[PDB]
Amino acid sequence: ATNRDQESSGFAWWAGNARLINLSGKLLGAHVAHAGLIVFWAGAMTLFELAHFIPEKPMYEQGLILIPHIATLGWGVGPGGEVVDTFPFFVVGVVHLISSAVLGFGGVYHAIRGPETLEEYSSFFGYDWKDKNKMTTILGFHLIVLGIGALLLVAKAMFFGGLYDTWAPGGGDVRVITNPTLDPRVIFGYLLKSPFGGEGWIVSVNNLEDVVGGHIWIGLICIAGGIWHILTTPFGWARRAFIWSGEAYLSYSLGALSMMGFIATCFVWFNNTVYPSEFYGPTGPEASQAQAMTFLIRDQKLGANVGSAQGPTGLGKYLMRSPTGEIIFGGETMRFWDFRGPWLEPLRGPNGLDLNKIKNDIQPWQERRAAEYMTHAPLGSLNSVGGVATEINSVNFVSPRSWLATSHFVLAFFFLVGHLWHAGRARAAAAGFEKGIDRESEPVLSMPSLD
Amino acid sequence: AELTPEVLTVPLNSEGKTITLTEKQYLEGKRLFQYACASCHVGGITKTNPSLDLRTETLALATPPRDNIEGLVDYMKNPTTYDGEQEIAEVHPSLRSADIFPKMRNLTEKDLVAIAGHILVEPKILGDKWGGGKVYY
Amino acid sequence: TTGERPFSDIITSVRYWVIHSITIPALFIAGWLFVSTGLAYDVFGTPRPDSYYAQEQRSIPLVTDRFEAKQQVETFLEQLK
Amino acid sequence: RGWFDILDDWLKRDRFVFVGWSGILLFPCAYLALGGWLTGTTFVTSWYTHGLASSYLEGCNFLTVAVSTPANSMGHSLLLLWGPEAQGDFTRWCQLGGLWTFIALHGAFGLIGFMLRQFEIARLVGVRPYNAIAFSAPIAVFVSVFLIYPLGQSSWFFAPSFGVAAIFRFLLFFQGFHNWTLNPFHMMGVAGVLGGALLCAIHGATVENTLFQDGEGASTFRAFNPTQAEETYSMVTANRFWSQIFGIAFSNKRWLHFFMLFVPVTGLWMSAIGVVGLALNLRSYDFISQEIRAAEDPEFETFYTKNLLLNEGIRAWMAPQDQPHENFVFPEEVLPRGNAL
Amino acid sequence: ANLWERFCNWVTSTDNRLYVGWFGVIMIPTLLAATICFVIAFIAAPPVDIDGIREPVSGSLLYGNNIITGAVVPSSNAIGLHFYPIWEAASLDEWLYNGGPYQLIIFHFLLGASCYMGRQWELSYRLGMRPWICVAYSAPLASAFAVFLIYPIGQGSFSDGMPLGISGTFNFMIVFQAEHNILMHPFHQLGVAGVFGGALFCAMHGSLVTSSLIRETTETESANYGYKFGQEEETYNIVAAHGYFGRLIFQYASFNNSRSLHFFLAAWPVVGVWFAALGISTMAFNLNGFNFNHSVIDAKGNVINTWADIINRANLGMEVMHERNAHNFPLDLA
Amino acid sequence: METLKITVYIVVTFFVLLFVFGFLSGDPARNPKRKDLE
């Protein structure tokens, strides 16, 4: 039983997977088996959601987070996001579940049956962490894989049904993307936008052309980069800047994933394009705005002139100006005026909310949508009582946007912590004092006193 | 205190006829009300227009009267403004607008009766809490 | 060590489990019945779900007199007919 | 070697659970306080004292169960089982809130017992009794909050009830009625608790990251012997690190650990003084200059006046259900409310 | 050696009275800026329209505040999450009316404290230390992020970030309880276990070590003089300390390993406070405390209050009173 | 304001460049023990 106790390995049971660091075959096993865990949960969770799914209820009233993901890709839904066929959901679930058996098979094999090290078995599959060449090559393979995935999204969007477009003229619908955005000014333009209000960095992407073109770009970039990393070895400055070891690489990727986690938190909280509100429920901004719209409509039906109604503070009760002058909804929702949504935009003119349009053009479907979104705001308790904390039990509801945002903030945080942990440790180990200070060679003792 | 047959006896129509709901009907009513109505009417108020509540006195002063089973069933089919003057199916869930309010599609006549009964019985249990809003929490 | 037998020994011994595979379920079942028979309600004076209010009452039976509190609670209970 | 000394012998035997003379006070009182809390929270109502359900039996969960205080009309009655109120009736006694006084009193004597235990064992083992001394802060807190505070008020009713959500209520009540967060004694308390937590964190982390390599293992816990003479971490390296990071650093270990005793213990004692003040409604509620200005000048606003508006909300909206003996009826129109809400 | 090389050697020098380092290169100017702006504002800033309703709140000393009431007031609701640096204002007077100082200070400070964490890593590396003191620091830091950045992001406005002042902090806490019922949230409860527990364990460790100090002094001098800085011998008898504690509870509830013990001392409050931070950071997206309002019901259907319903009543008072002129519609949705 | 903005932009860029180029300047080697970390 090689390296399977503290004595031989140096690592206690609670740090047991650290015993796998230079056992490439067993480590392969752990990784493939974990991949199987992920795929398993995708499929199983999908089937669970689908069994618990009433088609004539909004997805977001049913605690669904995967079916919304499938629906956004254009599978299973029609105009307005209405479920017209559940079978594709069933397929996604079943095929992931079946695939997880394969992955778990391979993982269990490599983990407790196959060659514990791969280097003496195969020079192609074996590796040394310090071998910068081989490392960048494996990196390369996987970059090619990622690029291929992004291109799979492109292909779905352009050649296999299209995507669900909440912005589709005449109402949200599945639409084929025929003219993806290729212009780099736009695509990387997103990357150079401020993350602050009214800008929102890449989180602000608000049309499917930009999304598809974005993935075209990312796919080519990843494939080219992957080939590049197969055919080269790290340059000198890179060599002198980095720590070259398993734990170090793990730390780098942990930092990356933490970043990605935070980014996704913001994505699901603000964006309503790749997270359609039809499937995920309204964003917080969306719902607040929707309340303002709702009572503007009610009060205006009662005979109120909403453009001239002065609120208690002196600001418009219904309508006011943004700091740069655009007409916007009044009340606290003044903070959310950067919100844009398919149900509100028909009321918007060059200077913002248009009073004539507001007086004459508001349609019943808009009232409906505003009411729905206002009454499904992403607020709710941990035991899933919907509404503000003071609400009485009755409505079983917490928005999928809340579940997704909170989960992924928690995970991004702990992954940042993990990055600090393993980065610091990788530095200490590479320099050689990760187990403590050498009593006979205590560095501080050879330093001049501070005073 | 118990949920008695007397508590569960509510006006069927405007002409003094009553109907006694079973306990199964009461539970069905609460479930269906939560299913199709509570998002706006939790606790007997109305979130998208708090001026109108689901208190029995309020429903009685509505036009046509809505403080009985037939009134509430009709409302769930062809809802009107408080004065009866406008049909508001286009902005309020009903069987008539099941196409644009899809949770209404699987509601049967039986279901409408259960919901109606819930709306009428619950104030008999909760008193001023029903339609009271946060003051009465 | 302080002279008692190690717990590791005891709980992994056969005799321990011969004893406790009887004594633990017995206790559990006893507590269960203490609830299911309704004895708990009567011992501790706790309201059953139908004994918080009389049918048309909506006033909490709050104790308001220190020295005749017992008689108060008793009257409150009689008020449930 | 007479009976007293034979008894002493037996009480002080080196067994799995040390007994001692102090164990005679401690174990029955601690057991009765624990058991009383568990009995009450499992089976016992609060209907007749508060108009509340408070047990598992009634449908409460871990967060909402409590052994609640007695009715306000009981005043500060010891509420003994054989007293003039319960008159020997166990059931009535439960209904009147006897378990609250039972738990608080047995609990208090249990805390005395436990601190006595700390002295007794320290004396037997040959160490200085600084653990017991430190335990005086828990005592001060329990006695000020559960005994003195309600004794200053109308009755045991306004003591904290023994329950999670019940304690949360105690907190919110103290904000609304006492403006307790404004109180400099509470603030000293907060500084002692958060400062204590900080010291705990930073000392543990510092020791763990200035360890000497005393083994070959990457898991470094085994490279310590309890009997060893040498420091297991470098105080000199620790000192230079913190000196260059924060400007100052401990250099004396004895001072460091005394300080770790001193900060949280002092914090808790101060908080105790504040609650003793709140027993008499002797609050730090207001700043008189603030109020003179605000009263005369309707454009003057600070976070202090903001918080008082919050307090006013709390009192008006919580009092009728939180204080049922008062029979408060606050008509809708008199409830303080901002716009819309 | 060239100029840049020399400069690097200085920056990363182990011999500076205060370590600089590359994290320090960012930390020092940002912390200085945040500090200077904070002091000037706290003394002399005019009232700030925090809630964007032209209802300016006075935070500074010169404008009617003492130490307890004073604050640097959060930026205007009208601004929301917009970036509002000095050069976006038409003038310093506008900048001040709209709460610009708050954004300048909290951004410079969040950056500076982040670099403080990094710098703790850096110096540990230069001194041949183990690296994880910075991980302990990550807990208070995460909390700072939670109340100055994350909660504003989730609620859509830096106007809901925690105010830089004592009373402002209490304001934040009370409004937070109103809208998220944070007391009933298990992550806040773990945070309380974290700091109550940290306090307990601080007092306990402090008192056990103090109780087992080895006699090295006379009764007329401080016992502290019995320890000398850098002595290789431990200054207390941990066998005696463990004998005591193990007898106080029972033997196996006590630590015989100093490393294990100190690791515990680090882990408990750090993890607890991590959960406090995550609690704030997730209530940022309105996943709130447990709601057991009207959870218990009798046979007829009457509501039977629990302590949770009393809590609910208090929250209601807070809710209806907070920001009394800022809401025009019935639901406070952010 | 435009002068202030340009000024701050230049300052921030200066210090950021210092940070980056600093950490690129053989930082793993800046420790007491093993320096060959390339």
Ligand code: CLA
């Ligand atoms: C994702 C979770 C995960 C995975 C994939 C692994 C994987 C691994 N661990 Mg780690 N470990 C984990 C979590 C995980 N661990 C956790 C949470 C802890 C703390 C408890 C540890 C503590 C730990 C220690 C202390 C050690 C390991 C070791 C190992 C390796 C050898 C296992 C072995 O030889 O045991 C043999 C086990 C058995 C013979 C029992 C059966 C195990 C199989 C895999 C169960 C399969 C179940 C599955 C349903 C079957 C599906 C079949 C179907 C597909 C046909 C292996 C690569 C060891 C190592 O590094 O060796 C060099 C080692 O010493 N682990």
Ligand code: CLA
């Ligand atoms: C891809 C992500 C990843 C990978 C591959 C690793 C890999 C490793 N970590 Mg790292 N780590 C990570 C992320 C990762 N970590 C994160 C996100 C954190 C922040 C918490 C850490 C913090 C950390 C520390 C402090 C340490 C490691 C250590 C290690 C090494 C040993 C791990 C082990 O055997 O634990 C065995 C697994 C366990 C003992 C199980 C832990 C139980 C968790 C905490 C419960 C989580 C609750 C669960 C999610 C929900 C409740 C479920 C319950 C109700 C059933 C191994 C190389 C050790 C090391 O330094 O080796 C060099 C070590 O000391 N990691």
Ligand code: CLA
């Ligand atoms: C990205 C992760 C994620 C998200 C956002 C969701 C979200 C949801 N799930 Mg899903 N699910 C997940 C992963 C996730 N799940 C996993 C891993 C499983 C297997 C356990 C499931 C299995 C599952 C089932 C069977 C069901 C759901 C349901 C739901 C819905 C209700 C959630 C609820 O009430 O939680 C309750 C909240 C909790 C239980 C609190 C969890 C707190 C964790 C343990 C804290 C952990 C912190 C950290 C990880 C620990 C680190 C330690 C530190 C020291 C380092 C909601 C949409 C329900 C539904 O409505 O279906 C339609 C439902 O029935 N989920």
Ligand code: CLA
């Ligand atoms: C995913 C990562 C991965 C990696 C790097 C390896 C690597 C290895 N495996 Mg393992 N294995 C894996 C997953 C992996 N396997 C899985 C998923 C299973 C379950 C089927 C197994 C079951 C398994 C067994 C039973 C054996 C190995 C063996 C080997 C070794 C010989 C490989 C060879 O010469 O094949 C030659 C390569 C080919 C014939 C080409 C394969 C064509 C592929 C499968 C087409 C699909 C490609 C596409 C990208 C798949 C995407 C899947 C993704 C969506 C999840 C090599 C070290 C052998 C060994 O260790 O001997 C000592 C061995 O006996 N593997």
Ligand code: CLA
């Ligand atoms: C998984 C993704 C991945 C990873 C881990 C790597 C890893 C690496 N790359 Mg590779 N690369 C990739 C994808 C990846 N690459 C792709 C997709 C391409 C095609 C575009 C390339 C093209 C490429 C080239 C041409 C080179 C590398 C090189 C390298 C090596 C050193 C790079 C470095 O120092 O980064 C650290 C990054 C920097 C030092 C950049 C400047 C630092 C600033 C401050 C970053 C600020 C970013 C900011 C925080 C991001 C916010 C958003 C932003 C848009 C505003 C390292 C092994 C170098 C090498 O050694 O090749 C052999 C090299 O010359 N890569």
Ligand code: CLA
């Ligand atoms: C040492 C452990 C200990 C201590 C300090 C206490 C202390 C207390 N108990 Mg608890 N109790 C204990 C163990 C203890 N108990 C045990 C083991 C049981 C299980 C039987 C109980 C069961 C119990 C119940 C059911 C109740 C208490 C109550 C009390 C409180 C009132 C007691 C009182 O007035 O006594 C008065 C008696 C003395 C102080 C004895 C002193 C006698 C002197 C020294 C000798 C003279 C005696 C004389 C010769 C007798 C002549 C009699 C003649 C006149 C007829 C007090 C806080 C009451 C309470 O908490 O109400 C809220 C209550 O209802 N206890």
Ligand SMILES: CC1=C(/C=C/C(C)=C/C=C/C(C)=C/C=C/C=C(C)/C=C/C=C(C)/C=C/C2=C(C)CCCC2(C)C)C(C)(C)CCC1
């Ligand atoms: C290594 C290791 C580990 C781990 C392991 C793992 C992680 C594994 C995994 C595994 C896996 C990952 C597995 C999987 C499996 C799967 C399966 C086996 C499946 C099957 C399926 C089916 C059979 C289906 C069915 C169906 C259909 C078809 C239709 C619908 C319905 C149903 C569902 C019925 C541990 C930690 C223990 C430790 C030791 C070492």
Ligand SMILES: CC1=C(/C=C/C(C)=C/C=C/C(C)=C/C=C/C=C(C)/C=C/C=C(C)/C=C/C2=C(C)CCCC2(C)C)C(C)(C)CCC1
């Ligand atoms: C898909 C899509 C898109 C696109 C995207 C893109 C195009 C992206 C890109 C991206 C990118 C392009 C990214 C990048 C990143 C980078 C990073 C993240 C970096 C990092 C770095 C580092 C970390 C470094 C560090 C350091 C320093 C600084 C100093 C020296 C040392 C060292 C090296 C350590 C859009 C939006 C259009 C739309 C949607 C869809």
Ligand SMILES: CC1=C(/C=C/C(C)=C/C=C/C(C)=C/C=C/C=C(C)/C=C/C=C(C)/C=C/C2=C(C)CCCC2(C)C)C(C)(C)CCC1
């Ligand atoms: C009061 C009184 C008394 C006393 C009695 C007693 C002494 C009792 C005891 C009692 C007891 C002694 C009871 C107990 C109970 C217990 C229980 C009921 C438990 C439960 C548990 C659980 C539920 C667990 C949980 C958990 C945790 C804690 C953590 C880990 C995880 C888990 C979740 C598992 C006398 C007669 C003298 C007189 C009259 C008055």
Ligand SMILES: CCCCCCCCCCCCO[C@@H]1O[C@H](CO)[C@@H](O[C@H]2O[C@H](CO)[C@@H](O)[C@H](O)[C@H]2O)[C@H](O)[C@H]1O
């Ligand atoms: C704003 C984004 C900026 C992105 C910049 C990306 C640049 C990528 C290539 C970086 C080139 C690195 O070039 C780096 O700088 C100078 C060059 O004289 C060297 O300078 C350093 O060398 C040694 C290395 O031990 C140091 O001890 C010494 O203090 C210093 O002179 C670094 O060793 C070299 O690695």
Ligand SMILES: [Ca+2]
């Ligand atoms: Ca290569």
Ligand SMILES: [Cl-]
């Ligand atoms: Cl009314």
Ligand SMILES: [Cl-]
């Ligand atoms: Cl306020």
Ligand SMILES: [Cl-]
């Ligand atoms: Cl509003």
Ligand SMILES: [Fe+2]
């Ligand atoms: Fe210590």
